[PDB]
Design a protein around this nucleic acid. Structure first.
Lengths: 108, 105, 306, 78, 346, 54, 85
RNA sequence: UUUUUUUUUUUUUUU
RNA sequence: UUUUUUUUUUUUUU
RNA sequence: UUUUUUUUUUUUUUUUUUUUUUUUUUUU
RNA sequence: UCCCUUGUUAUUGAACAAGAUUCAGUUAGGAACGAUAGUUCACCGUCAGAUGUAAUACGUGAGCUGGGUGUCUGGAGACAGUUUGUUCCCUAUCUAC
RNA sequence: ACACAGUCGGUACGAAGUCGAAACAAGGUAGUUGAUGG
RNA sequence: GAGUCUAGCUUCAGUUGUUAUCUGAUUGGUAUUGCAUGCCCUGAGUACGUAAGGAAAAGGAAAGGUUAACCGCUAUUUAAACAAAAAA
RNA sequence: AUUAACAUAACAACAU
RNA sequence: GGACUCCUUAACUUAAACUGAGGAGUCAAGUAGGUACAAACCGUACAAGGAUUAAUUAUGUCCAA
RNA sequence: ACAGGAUCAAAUCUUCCUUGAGCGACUCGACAGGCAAAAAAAAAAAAAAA
């Protein structure tokens, strides 16, 4: 017994059921080089992609273009005079004008 | 942790005739290690453990020393920092175009 | 590290190998090679406190006085008490001075400890202590304390550890009464503690109950009087008694409270330290001033019945 | 006084290990170290047991011939 | 000192510490100890295959019993059922299967056959095994006037130690009733040596106690008659031989060398029974400081990709086998046997 | 990280009321996903405690 | 304490988290405990009416018609005054 | 003037 | 309302 | 040479003497 | 607010000294013996320690006892002493091609 | 284990991806942003 | 990661009780007292009171008593009785 | 040869 | 040859859980709920059995709830 | 740590800013010491060299 009510004692309980109620948690191997991602690309990956674009005539998707442009824009202040020429020539060959040329004019 | 002991004692002081000064105190009142007395759930564990990946992920994405420093700062409380973590940050800092050694960060 | 019977003979034979007594002078002159450049005279204030000192208990002695009354005094020696470091509010968070005393073999000192001594430019120390004082009495690092810090005829506060007596009984420790030796008394009742609690109304023994156990080894404090000092050998004679073994560490400070109010009121004392002026001599030995009235005076006390 | 109840198995179990550690730290460990010191000195020879005991010896044997370099035996003479 | 144990000793407590030994603290301490323990190993960086240990007799017993359990008959029976044991029955239903000793003998023969077959394989120098393999021996000793309390103390001491080491441990006691254990130890060592196994690689696995009975006696008192009795117990011991592979990993890597070996080595060194060349050779196993520094250098080498596990194992095994072979060759030559006899013997 | 913070100004407020309010936050009962087994609350910071009334 | 059994009224007092000074007063009667507060007991004036909170429900109608005091203690002119039980 | 009682299991009296 | 205040008082009626 | 009261000394400090525990480590 | 020590200075039939009733604290330091054994009380003699009450199962009997108006070698609570430690008994064997 | 040593209940995989996110709108380009003069 | 000394917390009883204005070159501006038995001395044969009679503010000291500490002195008990010469 | 009480050992466990 | 409570009433110190009478409920032989903590008071569409569902009752609605 | 940085720029001897409080202070990185012999009221007393 006690001062309060005994029945008025809510208890946590699941309102449904499923097979993932006892799935143990484990730490999977973590990637060692995260820079390999286009999103998180670097000066080396940028140059490799530019060389691939100049070599191949493949018609890539919009996403690639977008991401490539954005990354370059972001990292414009880290490029070298030799790498800027390659990156701009890729665009010129593929006939793409996403405002990239204006941005590089401030750092060239 | 069957039993977690924690008490707030009446420490010595002098508050009488106190003058309001717009300044921060010495330090926090609570410093004792926080030890849970219950097993965590999957989501809790995940949130606790995701730092290992998020750190690197954000370091990689960073594009300036400011960002780098900020990122590093955010995961301050994160214990058990492997050596390679330092190496990564150093490499990124050098690539970004240097940093401020004098920086508290 | 010899045998019992070798040590016992040593104890007896030691007396035959005593070096001759030194030659004590009447005057002393100090030069600039024994003075801290940073040492200066500072005027005291209302909220100013001095520092303490450390000493080793040597032994008791009996000495006369100007009136001819014999008194028992303990001899204390300051074993090269030197300041190590200081504490500041900005740095640490409290004003204090760290001092060292004693000597230790180099073949017993750890490397991290030796690192401190190298910095300090001082020989290895046996013991290290700290004192809290006011900020205006912080002595410079490397200054060597002297017996001249305390003026003869002032009250001092002495602190130290008591002796050890091992395991003792209730009757031996506290000094219980016990029971009679006769009149039909059980064997066990001779030295029994007796009642140790109340009835079922109180089912628990009160804390801090007087019971049997290991005796001795406790901190104790006492008041003392500065009777005589020696500059040559750095010796101090204290009137009264000091706890601890003949060689144990003891702390000495000034009077506190009533002791200060009643006694240490009209006694001019060098607040910071003893500051000798180059080119002037100082006494070697200082004695306590005699009293005013004749101690050997027995006046008449009337005894009238009513 | 007299016991009020019976001791459980758990308590006994605890006591066992307690006692074992107590003994090991104070008897066995000291004895082992004292035993091991005698190796340097020649074995002990008793006069009383001379009737049946083997002759005295100084040299100690090697229990691990695998790690025993140098000659093991001498060739017979002509 | 002189007839008095040191007063300033430190007695360990398994359930209490001045720094705190609570449940919560135990977890952490255990975690850290396990973590440190795990890391002490040095596994190879390249292996060709992994071969596990399995007991054919034990598998066959389970296979024999499973068919009886599921079908209710015996292997080959098509007309008859299974008859379980009944009170007063002398016939053992599982009489066709072997006993524990027979299975151990079969194991001891199979391991010998596998050891002989190993030499044929060319890639035997890059094969992993783990732990579990080795010959196993069992003995017994009954009629021991000692109780469980007394027996356990000794048993726990002797558990997980070298055969030789155990002997010393028991000898150092200077006890009377320990002689019973001593005799069992000595007999087991002699029997294993006669069986051809290497006594230098034999370790004590575990033990087992069996109650036998009691012998009560009268005891008169002022107002009662107590009953005084005596204890009777039987001790069962198990021995296992460490293969070369296992042996190497424990001494070279783990550096868990026995004490007897090191004492012998130090004795020889002190007595000048060996040259200046042996000190360095035994440096990895001479003293605790040398073992620790050696292990640290090993770890550094390993991290530097400088250390070859397989090469070290081969060198170790070759040196041990060469010393063992030279011992026998010199022993045979000591008798003055002929060249033909020596060649036929080895 | 999932750790929320609530900084309050207890200037001229009642101790009881403040305490009552704080309790709620501490307990985490204000959320839908409240579990009595665990502590579903959020960190609470209080200032100007000297200014309380009774 | 040492006493085995105690009165309920005393026990009640014993449970009051107040200073010894106020405890004594409370015990005496100079002070009362109400609504978790300590205040002076009500004052009963001669001739004037008592507070409506102390009389019985059926006595309130007659108590309300009696004279009432709307002044200070200094201005009070009662022949005799005492605490209302 | 009223809402606030023995709410005398604890906190609280936030009106 | 004023550090006036061991059982002593002033000012203002809030 | 040791022990003891039958001898001697103190009757002050309490944010003092003293101490087994450095805590931005929120899931060892 | 308990026998003495405090409330300078208004309660007093309080001149001083020595006294009587009542109230208040942050609860400070103190209070010696003997004869007769009529179960305790009025009183008696000494140092004048200076008119010296109750509760706690008679407080207290697995601590002791006495001329009447039994025994028990301490198992669990409590209290008084004491405890090296991350390691220095043993054991703790990845990943998988 | 606080428990007369019991009973009820008890953890919700992926993005830990990324050359995606386009047929809302705006956009300091952050896979950013939507309510509110007290 | 490790050695020393320490900050904070804890500690017989118990409390929250402290600083407007601001000497003009004129010797300068609160300060370690919480506490308390009896008798004696200065104040004092003074205040008071026909007379007898007989105070306080402060300090100083001799007994008795409690706690703690210690072996310089005294009392009780008690132990020890051995290696200076390199001619030894 | 033989049930229980009783005595010892091996293996099995990780959201800790 | 009965324990508590409601009304009347004998005895007692208008005392006591006493001693003894008249007539209703409960316990005895009644579960779970409320009354803080141990039969007697309130309520019950009052315990054959099972499941994760809806309701005006004593009574509650600042926190433990 | 005078270690980093700004300036038409500092007496010998840094004008000024950054280092969250230069990891509470110093110091060590082959650092540190449990057990044994011997000694041992607490405590102190041994350099290595079988």
């Amino acid at each position: 017994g006690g001062p309060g009510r005994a029945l008025c004692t809510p208890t946590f309980h699941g309102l449904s059921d499923g097979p993932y109620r006892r799935l143990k948690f484990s730490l999977k191997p973590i990637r060692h080089d995260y820079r390999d991602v286009l999103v998180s690309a670097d000066l080396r990956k940028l140059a490799e992609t530019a060389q691939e674009l100049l070599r191949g005539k493949e018609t890539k998707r919009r996403a690639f273009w977008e991401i490539f442009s954005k990354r370059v824009k972001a990292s414009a202040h880290m490029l070298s005079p030799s790498l800027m020429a390659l990156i701009a020539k890729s665009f010129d060959v593929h006939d793409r004008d996403t405002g990239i040329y204006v941005a590089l004019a401030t750092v060239l | 942790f069957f039993y977690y002991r924690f008490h707030k004692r009446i420490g010595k002081g002098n508050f009488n005739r106190y003058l309001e000064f717009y300044q921060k105190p010495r330090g926090i009142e609570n410093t004792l290690r926080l030890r849970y007395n219950y097993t965590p759930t999957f989501t809790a564990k995940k949130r606790s453990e995701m730092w290992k990946v998020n750190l690197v992920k954000k370091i990689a994405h960073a594009t300036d020393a400011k960002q780098v420093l900020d990122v590093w700062t955010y995961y301050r409380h994160r214990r058990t920092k492997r050596p390679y973590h330092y190496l990564l940050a150093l490499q990124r800092l050098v690539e970004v175009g240097g940093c401020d050694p004098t920086d508290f960060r | 590290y010899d045998s019992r019977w070798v040590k016992r003979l040593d104890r007896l034979r030691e007396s035959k190998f005593y070096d001759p007594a030194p030659i004590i002078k009447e005057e002393e002159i100090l030069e600039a090679d024994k003075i801290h450049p940073l040492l200066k005279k500072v005027t005291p204030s209302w909220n100013s406190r001095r520092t303490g000192l450390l000493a080793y208990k040597i032994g008791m002695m009996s000495l006369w006085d100007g009136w001819g009354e014999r008194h028992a005094v303990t001899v204390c020696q300051v074993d090269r008490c030197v300041v190590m470091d200081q504490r500041t509010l900005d740095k640490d968070g409290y004003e204090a001075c760290v001092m060292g005393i004693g000597y230790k073999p180099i073949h017993k000192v750890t490397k991290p400890m030796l690192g401190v001594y190298i910095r300090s430019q001082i020989e290895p120390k046996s013991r290290i202590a700290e004192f809290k004082c006011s900020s205006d009495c912080l002595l410079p690092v490397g200054h060597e304390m002297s017996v001249r810090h305390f003026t003869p005829g002032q009250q001092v506060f002495v602190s130290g550890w008591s002796k050890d007596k091992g395991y003792l009984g209730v009757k031996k420790r506290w000094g219980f009464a016990g029971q009679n030796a006769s009149h039909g008394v059980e064997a066990k009742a001779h030295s029994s503690p007796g009642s140790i609690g109340q009835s079922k109304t109180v089912n628990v023994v009160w804390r801090f109950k007087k019971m049997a156990g290991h005796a001795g080894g406790d901190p104790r404090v006492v008041n003392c009087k500065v009777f005589r000092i020696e500059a040559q050998r750095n010796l101090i004679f204290l009137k009264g008694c000091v706890p601890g073994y003949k060689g144990s560490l003891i702390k000495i400070s000034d009077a506190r409270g009533k002791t200060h109010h009643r006694h240490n009121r009209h006694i001019p004392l060098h607040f910071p330290t003893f500051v000798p002026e180059p080119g002037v001599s100082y006494p070697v030995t200082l004695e306590c001033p005699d009293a005013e009235q004749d101690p050997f005076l027995y006046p008449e006390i009337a005894i009238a019945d009513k | 006084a007299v016991p009020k109840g019976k001791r459980s198995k758990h308590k006994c179990k605890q006591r066992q290990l307690i006692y074992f550690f107590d003994q090991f730290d104070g008897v066995f460990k000291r004895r082992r170290e004292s035993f091991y010191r005698s190796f340097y000195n020649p074995p002990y020879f008793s006069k009383q047991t001379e009737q049946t005991s083997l002759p005295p010896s100084v040299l100690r044997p090697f229990r691990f011939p695998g790690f025993w370099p140098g000659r093991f035996a001498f060739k017979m003479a002509s | 000192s002189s007839g008095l144990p040191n007063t300033k000793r430190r007695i360990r407590d398994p359930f209490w510490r001045r720094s705190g030994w609570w449940r919560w603290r135990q977890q952490e301490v255990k975690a850290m100890n396990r973590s440190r323990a795990f890391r002490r190993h040095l596994f190879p960086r390249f292996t060709t295959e992994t071969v596990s240990f399995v007991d054919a007799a034990e598998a066959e017993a389970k296979r024999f019993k499973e068919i009886v359990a599921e079908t209710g008959r015996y292997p080959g029976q098509t007309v008859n059922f299974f008859v379980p044991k009944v009170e007063g029955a002398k016939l053992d239903p599982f009489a066709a299967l072997p006993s524990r000793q027979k299975r151990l003998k079969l194991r001891r023969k199979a391991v010998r056959e596998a050891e002989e077959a190993e030499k044929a394989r060319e890639d035997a120098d890059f094969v992993w095994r783990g732990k579990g393999g080795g010959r196993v021996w069992e003995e017994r000793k009954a009629n021991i006037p000692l109780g469980k309390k007394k027996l356990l103390l000794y048993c726990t001491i002797i558990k997980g130690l070298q055969i030789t080491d155990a002997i010393d441990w028991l000898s150092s006691l200077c006890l009377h009733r320990v002689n019973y254990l001593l005799n069992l130890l000595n007999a087991s060592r002699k029997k294993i040596h006669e069986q051809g196994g290497d006594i230098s690689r034999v370790y004590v696995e575990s033990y087992m106690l069996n109650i036998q009975g009691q012998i009560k006696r009268p005891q008169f008192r002022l107002r009662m008659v107590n009953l005084i009795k005596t204890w009777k117990f039987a001790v069962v011991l198990r021995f296992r031989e460490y293969p070369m592979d296992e042996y190497f990993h424990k001494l070279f890597i783990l550096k868990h060398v026995p004490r007897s070996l090191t004492t012998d080595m130090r004795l020889a060194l002190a007595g000048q029974r060996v040259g200046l060349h042996a000190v360095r050779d035994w440096y990895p196993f001479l003293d605790s400081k040398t073992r620790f520094f050696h292990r640290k250098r090993l770890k550094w080498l390993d991290r530097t990709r400088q250390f070859d596990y397989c090469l070290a194992r081969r060198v170790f095994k070759s040196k041990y086998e060469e010393n063992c072979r030279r011992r026998k060759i010199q022993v045979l030559q000591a008798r003055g046997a002929s060249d033909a006899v020596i060649e036929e013997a080895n | 990280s999932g750790n929320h913070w609530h900084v309050l100004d207890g200037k001229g407020r009642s101790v009881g009321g403040l305490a009552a309010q704080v309790v709620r936050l501490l307990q985490g009962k204000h959320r839908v996903d409240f579990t009595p087994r665990t502590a579903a609350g959020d960190s609470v910071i209080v200032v100007n405690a000297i200014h309380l009334k009774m | 304490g040492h006493k085995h059994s105690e009165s309920v009224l005393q026990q009640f007092y014993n449970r009051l988290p107040v200073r010894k000074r106020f405890l004594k007063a409370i015990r005496k009667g100079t002070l009362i405990w109400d609504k978790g507060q300590v205040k002076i007991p009500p004052i009963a004036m001669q001739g004037y009416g008592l507070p409506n909170k102390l009389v019985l429900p059926h006595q309130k109608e007659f108590n309300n018609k009696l004279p009432k005091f709307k002044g200070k203690i200094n201005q009070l002119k009662a022949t005799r005054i005492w605490f209302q039980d």
